[PDB]
Amino acid sequence: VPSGQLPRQLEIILEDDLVDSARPGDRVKVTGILDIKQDSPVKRGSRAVFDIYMKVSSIEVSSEEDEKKIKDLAKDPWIRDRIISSIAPSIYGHWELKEALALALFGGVPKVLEDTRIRGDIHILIIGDPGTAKSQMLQFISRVAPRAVYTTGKGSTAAGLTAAVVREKGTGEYYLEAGALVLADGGIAVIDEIDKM
Amino acid sequence: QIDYRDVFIEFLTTFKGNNNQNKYIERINELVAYRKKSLIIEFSDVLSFNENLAYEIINNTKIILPILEGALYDHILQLDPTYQRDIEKVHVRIVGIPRVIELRKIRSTDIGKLITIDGILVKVTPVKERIYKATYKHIHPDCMQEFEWPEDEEMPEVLEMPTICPKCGKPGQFRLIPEKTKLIDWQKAVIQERPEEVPSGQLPRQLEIILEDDLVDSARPGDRVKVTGILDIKQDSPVKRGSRAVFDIYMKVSSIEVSSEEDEKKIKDLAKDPWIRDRIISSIAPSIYGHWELKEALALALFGGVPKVLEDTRIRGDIHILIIGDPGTAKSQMLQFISRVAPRAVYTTGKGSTAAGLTAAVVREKGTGEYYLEAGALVLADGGIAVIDEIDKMRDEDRVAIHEAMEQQTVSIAKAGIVAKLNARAAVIAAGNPKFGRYISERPVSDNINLPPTILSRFDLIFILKDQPGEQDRELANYILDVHSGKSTKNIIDIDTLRKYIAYARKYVTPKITSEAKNLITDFFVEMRKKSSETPDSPILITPRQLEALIRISEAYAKMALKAEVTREDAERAINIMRLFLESVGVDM
Amino acid sequence: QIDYRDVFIEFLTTFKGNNNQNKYIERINELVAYRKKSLIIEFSDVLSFNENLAYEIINNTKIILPILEGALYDHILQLDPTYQRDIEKVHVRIVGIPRVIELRKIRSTDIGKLITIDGILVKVTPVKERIYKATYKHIHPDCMQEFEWPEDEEMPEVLEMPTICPKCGKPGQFRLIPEKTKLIDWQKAVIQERPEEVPSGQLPRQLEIILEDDLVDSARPGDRVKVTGILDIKQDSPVKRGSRAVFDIYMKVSSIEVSSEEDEKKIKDLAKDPWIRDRIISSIAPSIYGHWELKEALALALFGGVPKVLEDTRIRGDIHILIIGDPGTAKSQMLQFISRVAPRAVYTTGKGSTAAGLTAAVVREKGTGEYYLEAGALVLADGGIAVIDEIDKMRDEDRVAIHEAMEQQTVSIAKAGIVAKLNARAAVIAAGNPKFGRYISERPVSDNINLPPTILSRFDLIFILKDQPGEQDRELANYILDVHSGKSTKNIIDIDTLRKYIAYARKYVTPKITSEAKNLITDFFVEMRKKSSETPDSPILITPRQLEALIRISEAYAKMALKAEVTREDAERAINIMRLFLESVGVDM
DNA sequence: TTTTTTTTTTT
Ligand SMILES: [Mg+2]
Ligand SMILES: [Mg+2]
Ligand SMILES: [Zn+2]
Ligand SMILES: [Zn+2]
């Protein structure tokens, strides 16, 4: 996005076996043919201006050499120390906090019992004086995690965190839109300035 | 090709059941007895009897289904002619189709084929009428003729009127004649996929289903059902131009399954054991050890007392239980167990789910602005059990209205020009955290749960759960890890058998109070009042509501053993459990 | 086919009533005398006279009702020639049809047959006009012709215009002529099923009914009614293209019954008892033990005083009662009994207890975006009794909003560009708990009640209920257990005849004050004022409102015995009950 | 319903 501008959007069409090939919030690479979009041909009067939409032919989300590379890293006896040392390299100190943040990236193993369920996710709360690089680390966590969402207490609403009802004015229909917590399912949700929410 | 009508008729009359009893004839006779007009058959039986017939049903259901219905109708009228002039069309429905498709996996290849879907009902529209054979009159000064426009064909889902009068061969204006128009019952429902099968990070899908004829009002909203039928593309408005060559898909329901005499025999047999009362206590929440007093109370709540309806007043028969447990005391384990074991239960929190927190609310219409009513948690749980976790942070509006619903079991509205009264006869089981994090023994109960003392008097029993760091910690730690690995106890009753046991007792047992039980309860209540009077700072008010609790608790014990009357033993147990409750809150009984 | 109008005319004259008085002959006379234009026929008197006439009326209702009505019109014409050119068409109403169908059980087969439905009226639209015979003029320079479009046929519900002029056989445009158009009165109302028949966990359903001609304004919302007629499909917007061959169901009302000379005889017989006052008091909440003085007060509020309307002022005639008591003192149970026996009552416990919900609310009409008033609890209770529960839990700023309603019996709103006044002539009965939940004898009376003196002066009687344990618990426990055992008190006036007695007394008895009663009331008021001046610490102000409370109470006692004037004994009873109220608040006399 | 600024009544 250029300076002082808002992000742009494009409409894509998935057909046949390409449906349900991705989830919202994913970074994708999409290939296909561009075409102009027609929606109300009968609406005569000016409006000789059309929008462009993409006709998808193949979609990629986000492999053998990498797996070999990963296995070699795990062979080092001090791999755990290397991983901790790699969390926010630009921050001095805070070794205990860095160690805990590494654990939350991996997490535990969920367990389904006879009656109840045990979560595998780890929740971390940080309280610190201003200027202690709390926000710098959280920015790093949201960038290194395979799936993460960064939110702020003041810039978030209850509807925007769980699900927002969108009335389809074209047909007068109600349907849900995924919120921040839903989009972070299976990942990490990062909340800054939780005390100010 | 081969006429299966003869095969179908002999199959029904010569079906070897569990003992070759020909159960299909039995239900056919039952159908004639009550004029049910709908016969259901199992696909497994058809396949076992003649797999060739089964394949035709599952492959060409569009063509051969009316053929089979005609053969069945002829057999029914031949067996009994009185069925005529009452039902002109019988219905045959297939269940247990092996072609099961997940809701999210439906594609274009499944359109027009017989498939079955499993899901949850969310919305049900009121019953309406659909035209399948209309009658029209040509308004042209020379015609004055009446005719049925959809000639030799059923009226499609799209209402269309003739352009040229068939009788006079002229165009013009046509008027519908409702008096000579055939109608069929029509209902629309929405089915939603279960949360278990929803992929991660995605919203649940929905599907529109249409119920017609006797299938209307076959399932209350919020029930897990299995639906079988045909898929088709919806046509909301075919005359709407604007491209949009895409369409949704809906389902024409042909058979719906929701979720015995032998059970009643085994239920009565299960009650023959004189130790049945203690067995039921053990069967409650087998995962958690100890907490026998709390387990005993929950068993009484499920059975409940017998409500009294008099000429001028109504007396509550439900039993309300309050649990105040420290954090980490696993107060949500049996609460989840209670919901599963209860035949009808509603799970919610203090704030509720919708705008109507617990009792009810009045909401303006989004489209028209008209005022209507929305049922709360208590109303939706009428006749069952309402499990309300986290009772201590209910809405401020409900903090006053709950007084009437908890005692009079009614919700009264006199707002925005609407006067209404809704029944709320539901037993309430609620859990709340202490207002100071950890419970304080020396302090009273009112200043420990953050509720008005009036509400406390409306609860039959109150129990306090404390996480005492005693010797049990080692056992508790081992117990917690054993639950992680997996373990179970023995000599209990499964939830499935227990659930029907409670349902049977609540429908056929109405215990009566005897003189011996009457005298025992009277003496204890007088004794209760004296003890509270002596203490000038009693932590719990002893009101006449307590006397009603003794009657209700004692009746539950008799209902627990399917007793016709209440005896001394039932009264003695009722007194003892109340004595423990007074000790728990810190009253020297 | 044979005719029956001769038998119908014969039945109207040859039928013998209970005493062979030929009421239908008398009923015809009343119809002619008052130009009633509508006649009511009981179905139980038709099959008894001729069973054959009963079935044809039920079955072929469409093609036999106009025939019978036409014959009756000729019978009236000879009975009174002047009835002509006053009422051109007459109507006959049939009630007590054996075909009664529950609202939820209506299906396709029930359309087109005479049925009966019992329910509750919730809303009525204002009276309108419907065209059943239109007159048109062809706007085409050649034609200039006027005609009635629907020939030999009543104009359908859908407004249809001619396409070809019958006078000239040419197309064009036509102009309606309102001056030559025949109209019929039209009204729409919505009926709701009673809560008794609503299934548990479900919201009540509604049905739309149409009242036409003299049936308009025959009932008001909130009334239990029994309606008879024919169902039909609703063609609200037939011009709406877009498929949707699904139609709703509405009801064409033929007769309506709301909620008898024999009742008057029964009521008058009851008043002959010298101890009728005692019997009425004993009949108030028989299931509640004790509280005799509170039961006496509740009886007075049900009957009330005599409002005075003068050329310059209006004087309140209603009686207001306030009850303060400890929890579990049967306050809510007794209040619920009032709503059952009162002809019109409104209940409000926790929801709608705000200022807007109690008197009136200004709501934005989303149809046009403007503002209009919505009736509150007190306005909806006009002419009846308003019951308020948990008054002590109401906010003080919300509670003061009813000061004008309790005394001036009007509600005035000046908000958001709306200035309006509404009538709120209702009796207010309120219940609540003391300041500290339970009454404390150590604290004075003033802080125990915790209410401003301004609102206390508006209550005619105030009672304090104390739950003090003692020797009466055994009697209370025995009485409660006896109630649970099914035992009931005898020699008690039951519910429905008590409701009739109160309704008759309120609208037919107007006692007047005599000279004997004037002296007794004046003397007590002077004595009461002196006692109040003696003690300045009293929590109750003795204002002139108290003097009028004595007048209102004394009139109610006379009205309770169907007496035409207030005598010495009635004044003495009013003074006696006033003494107890003063003693109940610590004001000795 | 949803975020927004606004005057208003009422949560
Ligand atoms: Mg920061
Ligand atoms: Mg009460
Ligand atoms: Zn024609
Ligand atoms: Zn003409």
Coordinates of C-alpha atoms and ligand atoms in Angstrom, one line a residue, chain C residues 138 143 145 165 167-170 174, ligand 4:
Chain C
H138 CA -65.8 5.0 -19.4
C143 CA -69.0 6.5 -24.5
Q145 CA -71.5 5.8 -20.0
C165 CA -66.7 -1.3 -21.7
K167 CA -71.9 -0.4 -23.0
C168 CA -69.7 0.1 -26.1
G169 CA -67.5 -3.0 -26.3
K170 CA -64.3 -1.0 -26.6
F174 CA -62.5 4.0 -16.7
Ligands
ZN4 ZN -67.7 2.4 -23.3

